[PDB]
Design a binder for this molecule. Structure first.
Ligand code: CFM
Ligand code: CLF
Ligand code: SF4
Ligand SMILES: [Ca+2]
Lengths: 522, 259, 476, 260
């Protein structure tokens, strides 16, 4: 039943007696469900250290992954260029999913096409699909550039993207001078971040490889900035802000900040802003090139050092106090511009915030995960705050990365109860927060299920999720936050103390029970 | 009904002996069908619209009509070609996989079904020997180093699918180069099988080939024609089906050193 | 509007190259409710033209995403690289009751996460090992499905042999589904492959079995995926009508329910497109008749209840009138409150293979008219059923491109649009109220009487929302 | 630094000739690298851990060192085998793509070689055409015979060349015939618009050496057949005729055969 002025949606509709009874008849009558005592026994066992050894002994099964496939990162990279249509060569299912995935995170439209390769194109090769697809996309959606990536099906069968695009131009499907950079992005290699690296390098190649003879390093007096797989709009914004604040001439290579944030003013804009073609062509003339997420920009680094002849600085991601200081001073060194009074003051304000809140942050234990750079900068920051990053998981991380983060953990007393796990998933981490319970988890939306599981064991065993990373599907407008710089560090710091205080207020809200510690001032 | 798969190096005349073997089969009054699953040869040109090309003309494979892909030739032998890409592109394996599925679902299946398969470089070229498909496998070879190496390799594939399901090696078929006879018998014994038949090198075969005919069609009363009839009768009556035991490269080299 | 939609169609198509121009032309049309045969008006279920931003999914989305995925007590394995599995992980709201990770596994993502060496060496040995791992780690699962992603289909991985040997060994039902994404042209062939996998590996398990106690009133809901609890909100009515609902296909479905379905007296088919295949099969093998029903909105729910009850005796028919009368005050209250707030408003829809014609009556119970409707992947038999349910000079579009939909909306100017997440933020930008008609914009149910209340509430909150009056700046 | 690809029908002696040729080449003092990309044969057994097997063992290709895969053999010829699945399973095509990519990325081609030889299997898919993409092999030599299915294979390969030729820099350097067959193959080349770079006579010494894991050059430098491979090597080193082939019809083929 439904009362017209107090209409119930699924929750709490199904909690009404007639539905609850019907559901019980469905179960007892036709589901052949295991007895609750058995369901309860198996759950408790999935909580133990015994189950955890078994879980970690897996070599073929992956449950609840903390990563995605290459083409997704490729689409994001391509969206950072002016009026470009990300084009994925292969089957269409991939594209519907890529778009949906990014729609749900950014709450914005995401434009991307496929050339819909079907069973006969799998057998004959996707050459015809590439000819017509490039022609149709250019004629219909009118981009200035089409950036081609690939799905696994096209990678297995070895569709030569370079030959297919050249034959497309040769037969008159698209103009010979129409920009069509490409990158083979196999799903079965690396993850979404690798896709970004391959695509960026593919575009860099396209616009600079042939033209290197008239390039002089440092002649345009700018610093190139390569962001990497970035889903926080505030990160594009803070870097552009800090450099302009310093008077540093820069060029940000792959900037999707405008397309991923157009105004609802009455019109839909498929394309907005982005790195121009000329900014990519003029890129080798820069003083140097700073890669913001170096651990997944390795192929790009090799092309920049190899071909552009730039001495890319060994710099970590600018997250936290030290790495932001290092970034600014390196940028200062390279450009010749001094770090201004505004940034100096901003730094002291973050330190101020740290001295105000250290009491609640000290010794707080965290389980965390994400992409290698993000999770590494996060570990470092947590460590500067006096926190213990007990479980560090990076599904898509490699062995050298684990070494680097172990080195960082070794440098501080707060990283001594810490272990790094690469190639492990959220079902592995589910165990870790059960056997070696931390205070909070810092991760994406998939960790809401781990929180649900820990709460089923009991209120005391519940480990709360602090939503930082990608993807965030169950909260709104978090994609507008900043993770980079002092600005990002201040945001991260506030979220952590307030999550701690929120939780304390919750555990102390019991009348005459625990509320003796339900303090007005904290 | 008996489903059989024929593998073996192609540069010998594997498809030619497959079609000649069936021709004689038809001449005996046996109803046979040839399913071409080899991208390097034409498995039906001597007996006589591939599944892939016709599937594309109809939209997809689901719109395909078994009638647009089937066709009879000498002695009424039914013939279908799986189709595949033009050289250097696509995936011929998937073309075989798609072809075979279409035939299963469209119930294309008759005394014998003969699959003329290409090199087992992948999963798709083994589809003909999965559960409920070909039960007997014949490997045509010769006394050539790599021709024998090919048969031994194929045997390794037969082992994987034989342990899994029900398919066996029926024997070796020697396409003579006139160099040999004994060598292949020795290999078969090493493999634990038999040299079902030694096919002499008569030039009539080539005369027929150029005319687009098997020997049994071109000139029945010819000497070579009886050889194919004896091959046919031996395969019709063969009872020796086993799981091969492939040898090492060392064992093959050592065998060749004795001749 | 009679010839204004034909000149619109031609004007929209003017932007395509010639090959795409001639193909899209036959995929768009204007309705004539006197056309029992849709093939001289619109063609469907043909491949998508390359590079035109189709909205379609793949066969895997159809198999794993919609048919097998909802089955709560089985472990469904996305076999291939990590992608498909992650993007489809809990994206569809196919509701269930169960303790996840213990006895239910719907919101979880089990993958074989293929690496290069699994592509090159093959992954059958990896699959076999994975199956042993889901057994020690998830002992309470009641079956396993193996959902093929593109690579499995090219590489020729013999997954049915693995399923056969591991299933016999572990005494488990392991279902291999050849639903690799490049097969077919959309989600649709994925439905078909899935239905076939159900009959070949699960449906006949309890064939010689006579242990189940049958009743003359036994029925099965076939094709209700329980989005937002849609199926539960449908079976409350069916069971209050005296019927016994032995099975729910996929929505909150269990494997035992599926096995028990051949034991029923009638298959009630909601989603015709995805499960007419298994229903037709159940008619020729077990003799079970099937009929189509619509639980969207009062006019249709009432009609459906009456037709369904007419297949049984006088006691069920009497209870049918009891239920119609019980909910009459309630749905009339909803109509009295929201219809005046919604009357005369125009809606354009573009959904999958059933909702574009199924939600029409519910919109019309609120006084709204659907001026345009279309499907991503329907066949002509769905379009045949669409002609009666739509108005006369209205727009019909099969596998609409991003370009076409945007421009059709610019001409027609509907007050509300109902489609998916990939077009939601496009039209909100354009100032047009949007409701997700796939995920119900995280609301639901929309099925039955209680669902109608939520449907009306939702169309009203979005259409008459105060934000739509503020898209333009007062200074321009 | 010339990269060459060798295609042809395997039942002939494709791998054996490639190796005897590279041996003669190394004998002239040329620095050569052989890349095995043929699942239906052993491409380095005569000159001497594949890339794919070594990769799996180490985790992935990214974990692979070039020294683990490259091994020097006769004449200092450097050998690399792509590797691939066992018979009837997997996908050898992708194995080739992966291996070549690894070689590119690991800077194997930039060491100062005179020649790189890809011994490729039958082009049944894009992966086995990896060797003829841009920045790879520029010269293609096909080993053939007077056999029909052997010449037809030569044509199919030519059609494949044509396709990648219109797209980039890859040409047909000619035909190599493994023993009036002498004339037949010459006409086949004229029809294709290329040449028969050399007619390798039939000689039992090749088998003698082959079964003993050697090329004739190593097995018996003084042998007459040895000088045949040295003759082929010189014709390859001095070859300047690179062309885009003009494939023929099976009809035109049955005409050529029927004329002999
Ligand atoms: S888009 Fe239903 S034929 Fe299928 S997931 Fe939605 S209009 Fe599907 S009703 Fe259904 S629960 Fe659906 S909404 Fe048939 S199941 S492939 Mo996307
Ligand atoms: S049609 Fe391979 S991993 Fe999964 S998203 Fe793909 S690139 Fe990435 Fe359908 S079966 Fe899946 S979503 Fe085939 S691959 Fe797309
Ligand atoms: S090796 Fe086989 S499965 Fe792989 S792309 Fe080639 S034909 Fe297809
Ligand atoms: Ca938005």
């Amino acid at each position: 039943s439904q009362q017209v002025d107090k209409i119930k949606a699924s929750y709490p509709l199904f909690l009404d007696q007639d539905y609850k009874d019907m559901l019980a008849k469905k179960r007892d009558g036709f589901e052949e469900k295991y007895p609750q005592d058995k369901i309860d026994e198996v759950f408790q066992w999935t909580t133990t250290k015994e189950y955890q050894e078994l879980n970690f002994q897996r070599e073929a099964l992956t449950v609840n992954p903390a990563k995605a496939c290459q083409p997704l990162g490729a689409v994001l990279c391509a969206l950072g260029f002016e009026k470009t249509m990300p084009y994925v060569h292969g089957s269409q299912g991939c594209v519907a999913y890529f778009r949906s995935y990014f729609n749900r995170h950014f709450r914005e439209p995401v434009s991307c096409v496929s050339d819909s390769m079907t069973e006969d194109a799998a057998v004959f090769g996707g050459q015809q699909n590439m000819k017509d697809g490039l022609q149709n996309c250019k004629a219909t959606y009118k981009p200035d550039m089409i950036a081609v990536s690939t799905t696994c099906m096209a990678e297995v069968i070895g569709d030569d993207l370079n030959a297919f695009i050249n034959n497309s131009k040769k037969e008159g499907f698209i103009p010979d001078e129409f920009p069509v950079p490409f990158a083979h992005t196999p799903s079965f290699v690396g993850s979404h971040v690798t896709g970004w690296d391959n695509m960026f390098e593919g575009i860099a190649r396209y616009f600079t490889l042939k033209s290197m003879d008239d390039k002089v390093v440092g002649s345009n007096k700018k610093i190139n900035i390569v962001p990497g797989f970035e889903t926080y709009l505030g990160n594009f914004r803070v870097i552009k802000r800090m450099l302009s604040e310093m008077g540093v001439g820069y060029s940000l290579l792959s900037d999707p900040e405008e397309v991923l944030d157009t105004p609802a003013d009455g019109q839909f804009r498929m394309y907005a802003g982005g790195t121009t073609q000329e900014e990519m062509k003029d890129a080798p003339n820069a003083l140097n090139t700073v890669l913001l997420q170096p651990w997944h920009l390795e192929k790009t680094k090799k092309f920049v050092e190899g071909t552009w002849k730039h001495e890319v600085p060994k710099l970590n991601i600018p997250m936290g106090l030290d790495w932001t200081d290092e970034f600014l001073m390196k940028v200062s060194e390279i450009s010749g511009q001094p770090i201004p009074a505004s940034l100096t003051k901003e730094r002291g304000r973050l330190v101020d915030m740290m001295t105000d809140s250290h009491t609640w942050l000290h010794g707080k234990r965290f389980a965390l995960w994400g992409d290698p750079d993000f999770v590494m900068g996060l570990v470092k920051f947590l460590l500067e705050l006096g926190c213990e990053p007990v479980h560090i998981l990076c599904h898509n991380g490699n062995k050298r990365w684990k070494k680097a983060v172990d080195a960082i953990l070794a440098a501080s007393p707060y990283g001594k109860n810490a272990t790094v796990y690469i190639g492990k998933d959220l079902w592995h981490l589910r165990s870790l927060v059960f056997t070696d319970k931390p205070d909070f988890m810092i991760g994406n939306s998939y960790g809401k299920f781990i929180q649900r599981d820990t709460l089923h064991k009991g209120k005391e065993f519940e480990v709360p999720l602090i939503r930082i990373g990608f993807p965030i599907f169950d909260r709104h407008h978090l994609h507008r936050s900043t993770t980079l710089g002092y600005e990002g560090a201040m945001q991260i710091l506030t979220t952590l103390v307030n999550s701690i205080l929120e939780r304390l207020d919750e555990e102390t809200r019991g009348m005459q029970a625990t509320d003796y510690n339900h303090d007005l001032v904290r | 009904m008996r489903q059989c798969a024929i593998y073996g190096k192609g540069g010998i005349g594997k498809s030619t002996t497959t079609q000649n073997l069936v021709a004689a089969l038809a001449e005996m009054g046996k109803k046979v069908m040839i399913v071409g699953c080899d991208p390097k040869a034409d498995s039906t040109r001597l007996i006589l619209n591939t599944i892939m090309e016709m599937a594309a003309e109809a939209g997809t494979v689901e719109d395909l009509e078994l009638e647009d892909v089937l066709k009879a030739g000498y002695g009424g032998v039914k013939c279908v070609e799986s189709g595949g890409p033009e050289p250097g592109v696509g995936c011929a394996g998937r073309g075989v996989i798609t072809a075979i599925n279409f035939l299963e679902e469209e119930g294309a299946y008759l005394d014998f079904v003969f699959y003329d398969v290409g090199d087992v470089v992948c999963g798709g070229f083994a589809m003909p020997i999965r559960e409920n498909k070909a039960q007997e496998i014949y490997i045509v070879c010769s006394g050539e180093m790599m021709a024998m190496y090919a048969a031994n390799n194929i045997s390794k594939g037969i082992v994987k699918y034989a342990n899994s399901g029900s398919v066996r090696l029926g024997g070796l078929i020697c396409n003579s180069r006139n160099t040999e006879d004994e060598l292949i018998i020795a290999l078969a014994n090493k493999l634990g099988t038999q040299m079902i038949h030694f096919v002499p090198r008569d030039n009539v075969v080539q005369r027929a080939e150029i005319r687009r005919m098997t020997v049994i069609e071109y000139d029945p009363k010819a000497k070579q024609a009886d050889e194919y009839r004896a091959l046919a009768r031996k395969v019709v009556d063969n009872k020796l089906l086993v799981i091969p035991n492939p040898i090492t490269m060392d064992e093959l080299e050592e065998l060749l050193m004795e001749f | 509007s009679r010839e204004e939609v034909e000149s619109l169609i031609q004007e929209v198509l003017e932007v395509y190259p010639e090959k795409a121009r001639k193909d899209r032309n036959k995929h768009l049309a204007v309705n004539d409710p006197a056309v029992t045969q849709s093939k001289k008006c619109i063609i469907s279920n043909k491949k998508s033209q390359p590079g035109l931003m189709t909205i379609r999914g793949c066969a895997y989305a159809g198999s794993k995403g919609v048919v097998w995925g909802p089955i709560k007590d089985m472990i469904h394995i996305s076999h291939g690289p990590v992608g498909c599995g992650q993007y489809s992980r809990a994206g569809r709201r196919n509701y269930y009751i169960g303790t996840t990770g213990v006895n239910a596994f719907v919101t979880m993502n089990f993958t074989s996460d293929f690496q290069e060496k699994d592509i090159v060496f093959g992954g059958d040995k990896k699959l076999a090992k994975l199956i042993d791992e889901v057994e020690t780690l998830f002992p309470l699962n009641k079956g396993i499905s193996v959902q093929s992603e593109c690579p499995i289909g090219l590489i020729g991985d013999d997954i049915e042999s693995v399923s056969k040997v591991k299933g016999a060994e572990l005494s488990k039902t392991i279902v291999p589904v050849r639903c690799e994404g490049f097969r077919g042209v959309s989600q649709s062939l994925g439905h078909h492959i899935a239905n076939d996998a159900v009959r070949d590996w699960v449906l006949g398990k309890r064939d010689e079995d006579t242990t189940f106690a049958s009743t003359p009133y036994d029925v099965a809901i076939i094709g209700d995926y329980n989005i937002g609890g849609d199926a539960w909100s449908s079976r409350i009515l069916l069971e209050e009508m005296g019927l016994r609902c032995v099975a729910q296909w996929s929505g909150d479905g269990s494997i035992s329910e599926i096995e028990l379905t051949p034991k029923v007296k009638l298959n009630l088919v909601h989603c015709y497109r995805s499960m007419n295949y298994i229903s037709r099969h159940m008619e020729e093998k077990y003799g079970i008749p099937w009929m189509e029903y619509n639980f969207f909105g009062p006019t249709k729910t009432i009609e459906s209840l009456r037709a369904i009850a007419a297949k049984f005796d006088e006691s069920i028919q009497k209870k049918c009138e009891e239920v119609i009368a019980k909910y009459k005050p309630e749905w009339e209250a909803v109509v009295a409150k929201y219809r005046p707030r919604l009357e005369g408003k125009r809606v354009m829809l573009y959904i999958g293979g059933l909702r574009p014609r199924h939600v029409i009556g519910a919109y019309e119970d609120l006084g709204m008219e659907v001026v345009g409707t279309g499907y991503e992947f329907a066949h002509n038999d769905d379009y045949d059923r669409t002609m009666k349910e739509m108005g006369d000079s209205t727009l019909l579009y099969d596998d609409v491109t991003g370009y076409e939909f945007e421009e059709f909306v610019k001409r027609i100017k509907p007050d509300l649009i109902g489609s998916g997440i990939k077009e939601k933020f496009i039209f909100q930008k354009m100032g047009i109220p949007f409701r997700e008609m796939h995920s119900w914009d995280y609301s639901g149910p929309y099925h039955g009487f209680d669902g109608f209340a939520i449907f009306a509430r939702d169309m009203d909150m979005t259409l008459n929302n105060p934000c739509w009056k503020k898209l333009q700046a007062p200074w321009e």
